[PDB]
């Protein structure tokens, strides 16, 4: 038997529903999103880290000249300078006072510590959402993960559960994401091969053990002016350091909807945003014909000063007469109220307590026990605890946000105004009639 309902996408919050196949005993259906994993389609652009500036041992032809060869090394800046006549500990290292040149080959290479301190730039084409649902149907329950992508059934075992397109296509990750040490930061890193000096990714590579690394450190070499052999390599401090200093707080502390961000793979998780369209074709073997279920022939609702609140602050009691004792479902027929329980063991005659929560200031929500209905009604007091460590379990429906007394007053004011304009119409009728009646 196919059924469908929306579910608030809020981790751990247990949604409640009652499926009432016509000839069969209404079956309890509680939907719970035990976890979620909004994992987008990542693609690695490049890795980066603090470059290590390695100045290879300078080459001097002494009396002669040198060809400034090319190289594959990143930012090869093998400029050549003449008239150096350098000195080592053994004194001069050439045999002429001039007509000599110093070649100062220079590279940037991955620092050995980059092996761990590296960072990687990831693109994210789309954020498909996968939610780890725990679902209980009747006196049976299963855990199953499904892709909330849409048609994607992602069902498991006998429950052909199918999720629907997320009400909102929210994504926490910006289009360009960089990962570091398992921290995540959204940042428009420069494209591959588009390095800029001192910016993030001043050096980039396919991966840490690649020989195709490039860079644009802006390395420049001055003349070896001092007497001792030395190469004046100077450059912008690594853009990796500037980013490490200025990247600010990571995404793990900035993504909205409470998204929790993890790495390997990059994924958002336990993020509470929008609603999840859910439909489920629960198997008929889960139902029983109404005639074989316990049935109550008298029922009434009594509420013990429901404290409306984010948690189960309200309490109410059902008094009943039943035909047979047994275990029988219960549910709320109003989404403004949610019942902490879903099924109860019912005596032949008696009563049972049913904890509940509600965002409405009232209790004007119908309660059902195995197909019977009772209109609960009472004023619910606001909760003294301004703050609790539990997510608000129900949405604040405006249609039930007005208290009965307040709704009465508001409708009394509008009733007065409307009745006055109605009297206006009535007197215009009276005048129009009198004018012709007494002609």
């Amino acid at each position: 038997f196919e059924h469908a309902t929306t579910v608030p996408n809020v981790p751990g919050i247990p949604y409640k529903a009652l499926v009432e196949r016509a000839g069969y005993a209404p079956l309890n259906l509680e939907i719970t999103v035990v976890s979620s994993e909004l994992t987008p389609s990542t693609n690695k652009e490049y890795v980066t880290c603090r470059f290590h500036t390695v100045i290879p041992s300078p080459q001097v032809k002494c009396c002669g000249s040198l060809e400034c060869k090319a190289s594959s090394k990143a930012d090869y800046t093998c400029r050549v300078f003449g008239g150096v006549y350098p000195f080592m500990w053994g004194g001069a290292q050439c045999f002429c006072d001039s007509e000599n040149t110093q070649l100062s080959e220079a590279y940037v290479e991955f620092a050995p510590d980059c092996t761990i301190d590296h960072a990687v730039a990831l693109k994210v084409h789309t954020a498909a959402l996968k939610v780890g649902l725990r679902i209980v149907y009747g006196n049976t329950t299963a855990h199953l993960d499904t892709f909330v992508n849409g048609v994607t059934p992602g069902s498991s075992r006998d429950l052909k559960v199918i999720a629907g397109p997320i009400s909102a296509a929210f994504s926490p990750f910006d289009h360009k994401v960089v990962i570091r040490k398992g921290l995540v930061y959204n940042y428009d890193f420069p494209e591959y091969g588009a390095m800029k000096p001192g910016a993030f990714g001043d050096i980039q590579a396919s991966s840490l053990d690649a020989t195709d690394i490039v860079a644009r450190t802006d390395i420049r070499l001055l003349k070896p002016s001092v007497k001792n052999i030395h190469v004046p390599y100077t450059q912008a401090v690594s853009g990796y350091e500037m980013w490490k200093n200025n990247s600010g707080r990571p995404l793990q502390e900035t993504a909205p909807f409470g998204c929790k961000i993890e790495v390997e793979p990059l994924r958002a998780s336990n993020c509470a945003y929008g609603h999840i369209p859910i439909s489920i074709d629960i198997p008929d073997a889960a139902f029983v014909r109404s005639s074989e279920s316990p049935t109550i022939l008298e029922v009434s609702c009594t509420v013990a000063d429901c404290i409306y609140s984010a948690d189960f602050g309200g309490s109410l009691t059902l008094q009943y007469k039943a035909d047979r004792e047994g275990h029988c479902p219960v549910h709320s027929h109003s989404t403004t109220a949610v019942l902490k329980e879903a099924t109860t063991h019912v005596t032949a005659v008696g009563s049972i307590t049913l904890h509940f929560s509600t965002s409405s200031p009232q209790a004007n929500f119908i309660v059902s026990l195995c197909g019977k209905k009772t209109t609960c009604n009472a004023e619910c007091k606001p909760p003294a605890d301004h703050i609790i460590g539990e997510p608000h379990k129900v949405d604040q429906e405006f249609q039930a946000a007005v208290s009965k007394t307040s709704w009465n007053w508001l409708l009394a004011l509008f009733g007065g105004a409307s009745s006055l304009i109605v009297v206006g119409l009535i007197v215009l009728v009276c005048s129009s009639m009198l004018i012709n009646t007494r002609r």
């Binding site: 606001p382 703050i387 460590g389 608000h392 007053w409 509008f414 105004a417 215009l428």
Partner: protein, 92 residues
């Protein structure tokens, strides 16, 4: 430190402790069931914009109720008097 907590909930994380999440309850001064003296202040606290909107709605409705009904009644009174007010000897 003071942090405004929305009904959606707020996460605060301190030093190295596990992130603690807390949610604001829809609870405020006054009472959704007292007289208006407490009703208006309660809803105003919960939603200033919505409460002011509803109050202006009531005021506008009252304005129509008063001035438009008074205009209609004045119209009928005026036009029912005038057939007599024009007659100096009519027995109303």
């Amino acid at each position: 430190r003071n942090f405004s907590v929305g009904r959606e909930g707020l996460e605060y994380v301190w030093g190295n402790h596990e992130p603690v999440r807390v949610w604001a309850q829809e609870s405020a001064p006054g009472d959704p069931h007292g007289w208006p003296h407490e009703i208006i202040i309660h809803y105003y606290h919960r939603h200033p914009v919505y409460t002011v909107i509803v109050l202006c709605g009531v005021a506008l409705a009252i304005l129509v109720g008063t001035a438009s009904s008074a205009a209609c009644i004045a119209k009928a009174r005026r036009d029912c008097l005038t057939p007599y007010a024009l007659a100096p000897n009519a027995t109303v």
